[PDB]
Design an enzyme around this catalytic site. Structure first.
Site, PDB file in Angstrom:
ATOM      1  N   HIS D  89       1.693   5.940   1.463  1.00  0.00           N
ATOM      2  CA  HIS D  89       2.725   5.228   2.595  1.00  0.00           C
ATOM      3  C   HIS D  89       4.138   6.702   1.819  1.00  0.00           C
ATOM      4  CE1 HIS D  89       0.009   2.392   2.876  1.00  0.00           C
ATOM      5  NE2 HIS D  89       1.190   1.907   3.230  1.00  0.00           N
ATOM      6  N   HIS D 147     -10.437  10.419  -5.712  1.00  0.00           N
ATOM      7  CA  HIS D 147      -9.216   9.955  -6.921  1.00  0.00           C
ATOM      8  C   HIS D 147      -9.739   8.534  -7.167  1.00  0.00           C
ATOM      9  CE1 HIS D 147      -7.440  13.735  -6.306  1.00  0.00           C
ATOM     10  NE2 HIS D 147      -8.122  14.180  -4.918  1.00  0.00           N
ATOM     11  N   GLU D 177     -10.043   7.182 -11.069  1.00  0.00           N
ATOM     12  CA  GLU D 177      -8.801   6.740 -11.417  1.00  0.00           C
ATOM     13  C   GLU D 177      -8.875   5.297 -11.529  1.00  0.00           C
ATOM     14  OE1 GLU D 177      -5.042   7.946 -11.115  1.00  0.00           O
ATOM     15  OE2 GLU D 177      -6.449  10.271 -10.004  1.00  0.00           O
ATOM     16  N   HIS D 209     -10.454  17.366  -9.844  1.00  0.00           N
ATOM     17  CA  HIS D 209     -10.724  17.000 -10.460  1.00  0.00           C
ATOM     18  C   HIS D 209     -12.129  17.342 -10.090  1.00  0.00           C
ATOM     19  CE1 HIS D 209      -8.018  13.852 -11.382  1.00  0.00           C
ATOM     20  NE2 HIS D 209      -8.084  12.874 -10.715  1.00  0.00           N
TER      21      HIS D 209
HETATM   22  C1  HEM Z   1      -4.727  -1.911   2.328  1.00  0.00           C
HETATM   23  C2  HEM Z   1      -3.870  -1.901   1.995  1.00  0.00           C
HETATM   24  C3  HEM Z   1      -2.787  -1.239   2.751  1.00  0.00           C
HETATM   25  C4  HEM Z   1      -3.289  -0.725   3.775  1.00  0.00           C
HETATM   26  C5  HEM Z   1      -4.212  -0.122   4.212  1.00  0.00           C
HETATM   27  C6  HEM Z   1      -1.667   0.206   4.524  1.00  0.00           C
HETATM   28  C7  HEM Z   1      -1.935   0.532   5.535  1.00  0.00           C
HETATM   29  C8  HEM Z   1      -0.596   1.372   5.887  1.00  0.00           C
HETATM   30  C9  HEM Z   1      -0.481   1.571   7.547  1.00  0.00           C
HETATM   31  C10 HEM Z   1      -1.270   1.654   8.666  1.00  0.00           C
HETATM   32  C11 HEM Z   1       1.167   1.375   7.840  1.00  0.00           C
HETATM   33  C12 HEM Z   1       1.888   2.305   9.097  1.00  0.00           C
HETATM   34  C13 HEM Z   1       2.560   0.989   9.299  1.00  0.00           C
HETATM   35  C14 HEM Z   1       0.924  -0.493  10.251  1.00  0.00           C
HETATM   36  O1  HEM Z   1       0.829  -0.036  11.501  1.00  0.00           O
HETATM   37  O2  HEM Z   1       1.587  -1.409  10.037  1.00  0.00           O
HETATM   38  C15 HEM Z   1       1.421   1.432   7.067  1.00  0.00           C
HETATM   39  C16 HEM Z   1       2.747   1.183   6.632  1.00  0.00           C
HETATM   40  C17 HEM Z   1       4.053   0.537   5.393  1.00  0.00           C
HETATM   41  N1  HEM Z   1       3.433  -0.170   4.395  1.00  0.00           N
HETATM   42 FE1  HEM Z   1       1.365  -0.434   3.858  1.00  0.00          FE
HETATM   43  N2  HEM Z   1      -0.799  -0.724   3.557  1.00  0.00           N
HETATM   44  C18 HEM Z   1      -1.280  -1.391   3.133  1.00  0.00           C
HETATM   45  C19 HEM Z   1      -0.620  -1.861   0.939  1.00  0.00           C
HETATM   46  C20 HEM Z   1       0.503  -1.824   1.773  1.00  0.00           C
HETATM   47  C21 HEM Z   1       0.927  -2.573   0.852  1.00  0.00           C
HETATM   48  C22 HEM Z   1       0.868  -3.753  -0.093  1.00  0.00           C
HETATM   49  C23 HEM Z   1       2.455  -2.659   0.652  1.00  0.00           C
HETATM   50  C24 HEM Z   1       4.284  -3.219  -0.265  1.00  0.00           C
HETATM   51  C25 HEM Z   1       4.557  -2.081  -0.893  1.00  0.00           C
HETATM   52  C26 HEM Z   1       2.989  -1.089   1.752  1.00  0.00           C
HETATM   53  C27 HEM Z   1       4.242  -1.139   2.359  1.00  0.00           C
HETATM   54  C28 HEM Z   1       4.617  -0.290   3.625  1.00  0.00           C
HETATM   55  C29 HEM Z   1       5.317   0.220   4.211  1.00  0.00           C
HETATM   56  C30 HEM Z   1       6.799  -0.094   3.678  1.00  0.00           C
HETATM   57  C31 HEM Z   1       5.158   0.578   5.275  1.00  0.00           C
HETATM   58  C32 HEM Z   1       6.512   1.229   6.518  1.00  0.00           C
HETATM   59  C33 HEM Z   1       5.904   2.555   6.243  1.00  0.00           C
HETATM   60  C34 HEM Z   1       7.175   3.636   7.320  1.00  0.00           C
HETATM   61  O3  HEM Z   1       8.617   3.540   6.512  1.00  0.00           O
HETATM   62  O4  HEM Z   1       7.684   3.765   8.299  1.00  0.00           O
HETATM   63  N3  HEM Z   1       1.819  -0.992   2.317  1.00  0.00           N
HETATM   64  N4  HEM Z   1       1.064   0.711   5.450  1.00  0.00           N
HETATM   65 NA    NA Z   2     -10.588  10.468  -2.378  1.00  0.00          NA
END
Ligand code: HEM
Ligand code: NA
Ligand code: HEM
Ligand SMILES: [Cl-]
Ligand SMILES: [Cl-]
Ligand SMILES: [Cl-]
Ligand SMILES: [Cl-]
Ligand code: NA
Ligand code: NA
Ligand code: NA
Lengths: 262, 262, 262, 262
Positions: D89, D147, D177, D209
């Protein structure tokens, strides 16, 4: 927690011009003796020329990435630009892009360029007058040469003309690429029937515009055009960073940017 | 794919002033007959007064959220501000915050305010002259009243003064909160020994500044101060949105914002 | 300074399902009696149906724009989603787009959806078990029906299956659009030779998936497919928001989001 | 217009481990022979160790700043992480911060880490099985060491456990962890009464690790704990980047990121 200062000028690759930046670096070090000072340069072509001479010349993005790697957390970026134009706005966007990145910089503030508020514009006009060569006589016009820009902040140059004229009707502002134009300046000089005219760079460092566009031997230079009109041109090849009075304004803007980190 | 236009003025809650906005809405509809037009207002206090009178008065954020819900995809936001000051910059940030939000607007462009480039400033000076009342005689000064601001874009008002003086030395710019001040304007009038002086709002709509600060019965108004100095003041209570020549400039800026959506 | 809470569910337009959201609103009000509570809905189609019935149903952007207009400064947005999927990520981006807008919200935090950390996943598995109908006998399988998604967070459903099996080998997770599929679930049931199988929605509210895809009279429903296989299907048409044990998890996530505002 | 690829791994500073990254670089070069390939590393401590050995080891921000200076316009950043956790992220946010900066990169896409969709998770489980040492006998358990993380994406490890068990009930996932823990893994092994157990790193490179936590001589290592329980532990000190079948998944994700640049 670790504060740093990043000084960012347009940049120059001519060695006669560069010591004026070192001067600015000494001023900053003197005012903030415990805060590390780093440099970056906004013109891509100047960074290319400096790297060609074997000199490190980071872009603002390279500089901030390197500072984040050194463990800085709070950085005041001070623009040594004259106006809040395209370069300044690019710098602001770059600076703010780094702020808050995971594991990187916490806060990145940006100091205003020289002509910031109308209060700055008035102080700049006063400082430019204080900076005039002692040999310039009352009534001899002085033309301040700005870069000029298609950006909306070009309006700072006619704004500055307003404040200069409040001080002396024979102080004029012209620009290479914007408004007022050099043709506008010659029209001002023609009505004054001026026989001797001083030319001073408005920008921090007297780079290639000061040396070639303002004062070059070529027909198109300001000094060449004036000589064709029968005017004795007196070019002054020092940028505004040389003046203590002008430099105090950038220093105050840096003080303001440092206060914004808290 | 669905294009919309969002017109954003400072806003006024006085009914004698508001028809000048409707005029602008007609001009836009006439120029872009197939594109839906929506309105928002940047002053929080004016939205509060309008909601109090039972009138919908969305902020730019409320307006764009509602347009996204209607299925608009590409929106040109046109500022009816005079300068790229605090209100304009807030608008730009809000507009761009909506762009690219998941399931929302694809592209949100923002048209420049009246005094955009130095080329706009020159066109504004020409349009203001074309807008003068037919009864104003040659040599009678005209003071254009701007809001003024602590923002750096305050420098647009002395910049505009530069362009106005290229046209007529008796055209003056003053502001309520910035530079040049009304005291500066009275000093200009004193040197001209002017006996009759016209006062015209620089802003799109003659709201509370035009009606009270410029022309109110109170001692502190511009017209009251001038009467104390023995000057016949002639206030003109119409904003610049009333003028076809001034309005053409905002229209061109909207055309530019619409072209930026592709 | 003014704190608010924005509760955001997928949304339902079926009146038998909606009281389960009101229940959640009561729980939040009981836990934070002095903090105003507002609602928004993430599904565009559900907002359309609710507006059609004459009911206000703001998107998260409409809701936050309206809260900024009320003078809120710090808002905790709590997701009532099950997984951090496409809807949750859209919500996070929208929320953060409002934060820091000139004259608008200062801070907008976002509470995690139900299956947040692996510690949440373990607590969810325990809460689902506590929520089972008293009439379900030991050894009778229970299939929890999730929406499923092409987003990477779909991996939460097999993750949850891991934690459920640590508690009871006959608890199964299936989804309408992702993995594990309903075919995968029938293969699990076939090896167990189960004669009676309970079906429970994993989502906050038993909307159209619970009522039609899980338990509809049509041939394609889960209960219809099971009946064709000779299994007595026992559908439970209440979402997880009805359970106190499951709801406590969303409440803890809201407490965490409120703490992030300071 | 100039396309580049930026490969980003956690990073390792142990020389026995590093050649596995070079292998990945060869695979990428073979698949995209005309596109320049650059490297960055996400762990701050590993960049510190590599710089200490006299080796350039840019952060993603340093790397992208340098690529912008080389005149790249479109860059596909490929994560060699296992899960979309904190590191991934952070990388996404950094990458997107560079995109659209004035005079810099036009478009910066980011390839998914190994366990992206549930379809990836299923392909990873199949690839891990294909990667098992030929000497492992049917029924001998294999523990894959991840990890682990406090981030919500920790849920990928129990999700992967679900897919592995669809293939072979004696394949287990443990983490240093997060969840499942090594204690959870020993409980799995105890019920199986396994006498010989293989240990394989789930991460791209067998760094510290793999070498210490999994297989170190210290009492706390996985192999030491197993030996105390009377189990013959068979550690395999190669990361998943060594396997062609596992590496194909990162390659497909890079192909997807390259397609997103258009
Ligand atoms: C299983 C848990 C999670 C997975 C698999 C995941 C996966 C992803 C993926 C694939 C993206 C790319 C954008 C999209 O396709 O939606 C993304 C973006 C993002 N995620 Fe998560 N996410 C998870 C949990 C979280 C949570 C709980 C937060 C809140 C803190 C978070 C914060 C963000 C933010 C802020 C972005 C935007 C990235 C950018 O700045 O371009 N993620 N995430
Ligand atoms: Na791993
Ligand atoms: C005469 C003074 C100024 C003028 C005429 C001006 C004009 C503009 C214009 C035309 C833009 C659109 C982007 C561009 O074309 O550069 C802009 C953007 C912007 N300006 Fe200024 N500006 C001035 C001073 C400043 C200063 C001193 C700051 C620093 C606080 C500032 C902050 C910003 C920011 C943050 C944006 C990005 C807008 C967005 O979020 O999309 N401006 N300005
Ligand atoms: Cl001198
Ligand atoms: Cl008239
Ligand atoms: Cl019950
Ligand atoms: Cl082998
Ligand atoms: Na200049
Ligand atoms: Na104005
Ligand atoms: Na669900």
């Amino acid at each position: 927690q670790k504060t740093g200062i990043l000084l960012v000028a347009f940049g120059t690759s001519v060695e006669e011009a560069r010591p004026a930046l070192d001067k600015m670096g000494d001023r900053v070090r003197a005012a903030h003796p415990d805060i590390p000072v780093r440099w970056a340069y906004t013109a891509k072509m100047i960074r290319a020329k400096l790297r060609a001479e074997g000199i490190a010349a980071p872009s603002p993005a390279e500089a901030l990435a390197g500072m984040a790697e050194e463990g800085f957390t709070h950085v005041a970026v001070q623009s040594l630009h004259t106006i809040p134009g395209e370069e300044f706005h690019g710098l602001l966007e770059t600076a703010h892009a780094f702020q808050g990145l995971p594991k990187g910089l916490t806060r990145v503030s940006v100091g205003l360029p020289l002509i910031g508020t109308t209060a700055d514009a008035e102080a700049v006009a006063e400082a430019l007058v204080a900076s005039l060569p002692a040999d310039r006589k009352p009534g001899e016009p002085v033309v301040f040469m700005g870069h000029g820009t298609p950006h909306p902040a070009d309006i700072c140059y006619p704004g500055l003309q307003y404040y200069l004229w409040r001080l002396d009707p024979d102080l004029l502002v012209g620009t290479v690429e914007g408004s007022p134009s050099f043709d506008n300046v010659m029209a001002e000089l023609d009505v004054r029937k001026a026989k001797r005219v001083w030319l001073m760079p408005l920008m921090a460092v007297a780079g290639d515009h000061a040396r070639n566009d303002m004062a070059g031997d070529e027909d198109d230079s300001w000094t060449s055009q004036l000589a064709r009109r029968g005017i004795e041109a007196k070019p002054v090849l020092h940028g505004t960073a040389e003046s203590d009075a002008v430099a105090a304004i950038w220093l105050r803007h840096l003080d303001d940017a440092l206060a914004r980190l808290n």
